[PDB]
Structure 1
Amino acid sequence: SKPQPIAAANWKSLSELIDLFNSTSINHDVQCVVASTFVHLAMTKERLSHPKFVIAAQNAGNADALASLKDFGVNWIVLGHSERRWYYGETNEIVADKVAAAVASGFMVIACIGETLQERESGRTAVVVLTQIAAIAKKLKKADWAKVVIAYEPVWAIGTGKVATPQQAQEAHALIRSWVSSKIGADVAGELRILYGGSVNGKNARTLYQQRDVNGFLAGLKPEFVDIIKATQ
């Protein structure tokens, strides 16, 4: 069966959304995550009180900063998110190094991978996406995967007017899981959460989650996130 799902919201009225979250009865087993840019961390940390949620940081790559976050009570982090790669110039290896540093500093890591429109249209989804995860794997030991969560972002269907179908999502999640099974271990593959990080809402979240290899979502910090959480059964 599927491992514990994750519903994660990635920051990019915050108070009003937090209250909404706090007031939400979540009846099933799902780890919820609110990922914040540094300036919003303190307020989110103090306002978010739902015990099925954890706070996550984003993009920290310095060991002292990681230690300070941990000391501050932040135990999750999101790394490799699309714009970090296509805009900020974080390479496969930079993201991998950040993932490894975070794991070593005691973080649960949501590590993001995904191909662009140009890459997808050149037929290079697999080589691009698997090369990204391969770089991450290179800096990890097998035991570390207990602290890793993968998020697949269809960058090609983000801001391009292109639209991903649940089958296209499943296809991508499946080829990732197959790579993990073969290169890391079928035991690791079976427990690994692979989250969908493309367009999601209350209309299609439930449909996406029904896919065999989808274990939750990395979505926007928005009111409909409540529906995304509920979609994880």
Structure 2
Amino acid sequence: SKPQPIAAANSLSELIDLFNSTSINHDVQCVVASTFVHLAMTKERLSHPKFVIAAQNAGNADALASLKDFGVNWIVLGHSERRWYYGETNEIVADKVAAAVASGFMVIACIGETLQERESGRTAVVVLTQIAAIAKKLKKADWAKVVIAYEPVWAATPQQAQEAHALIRSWVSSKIGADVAGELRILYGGSVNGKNARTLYQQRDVNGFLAGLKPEFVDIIKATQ
């Protein structure tokens, strides 16, 4: 069977009212990741116990310490623009991930290739090098706290997403262990809506979504069964 799925989202007050009133029938960890300045409000307002608040991109020991102290236990790291715009390298993201885990966080670590990388058939070498860097700073036991989001930056069909996710899980199995591989949530972080979410989740190696904080996130949740 699949590990517990994750639905994570990366005007606002209307969105949280909506999430709060939503009945979610099945086992699924929901995550609302927000920017620093909206954190307190989101935390005051979001009360659905199947949801947790995540920080984003924090990389400083003291910052992580305060978030944790503030009751934030999740963080999202390495999201696409962090790498292609802000210049966070494979190693910078790796160190952020290791720092967060050491501070008691559950980490959604993002990886993904650009259009130029996908077009040239270098998806595998790129994606695996990104996670290899992440793995280098983590111990096997740390993987209990880790979640991988695959982001088709280059954008996708369920078959394409399945192939990407499957290639990630094979590298994990062989380099980290089959037991880690089996428990690891690998989320699909490409474009998704209420039409293809359900289709995508059906894929053997998709364990959820890293999608947009948007009214239709609710359908993304339902897509995880």
The two structures have a TM-score, normalised by structure 1, of 0.96
Q: 1:63 aligns with which of 61, 69, 89?
A: 61
* 1:189-230 C-alpha deviation (Å, 9 max, x unpaired): 000000000000000000000000000000000000000000
Deviation at 1:37, TM superposition (A): 0.3
SS of the residue corresponding to residue 144 of structure 1 reads helix
* 1:117-168 C-alpha deviation (Å, 9 max, x unpaired): 00111110000000000000000000000000000000001xxxxxx00000
* 1:65-89 C-alpha deviation (Å, 9 max, x unpaired): 0000000000000000000000000
* 1:60-115 C-alpha deviation (Å, 9 max, x unpaired): 00000000000000000000000000000000000000000000000000000000
Percent identity of equivalent pairs: 100
CA distance in 1, matches of 2:117, 2:65: 36
Q: 1:181 aligns with which of 170, 173, 176?
A: 173
SS of the residue corresponding to residue 156 of structure 1 reads coil
CA distance in 1, matches of 2:184, 2:217: 22
SS of the residue corresponding to residue 39 of structure 1 reads helix
- 5 Å-filtered alignment, 1:85-124, equals 85-124=83-122
CA distance in 2, matches of 1:82, 1:33: 18
Q: 1:202 aligns with which of 187, 194, 201?
A: 194
SS of the residue corresponding to residue 221 of structure 2 reads helix
CA distance in 1, matches of 2:197, 2:32: 18
CA distance in 1, matches of 2:204, 2:35: 32
SS of the residue corresponding to residue 25 of structure 1 reads coil
Aligned to 1:52: 50
CA distance in 2, matches of 1:47, 1:41: 10
CA distance in 2, matches of 1:201, 1:121: 24
CA distance in 1, matches of 2:22, 2:201: 20
The two structures have a TM-score, normalised by structure 2, of 1.00
Question: Deviating runs (4+, > 2 A) in structure 1?
Answer: none
Unaligned runs of 5+ in 2: none
CA distance in 2, matches of 1:200, 1:117: 18
Aligned to 2:9: 9
SS of the residue corresponding to residue 164 of structure 2 reads helix
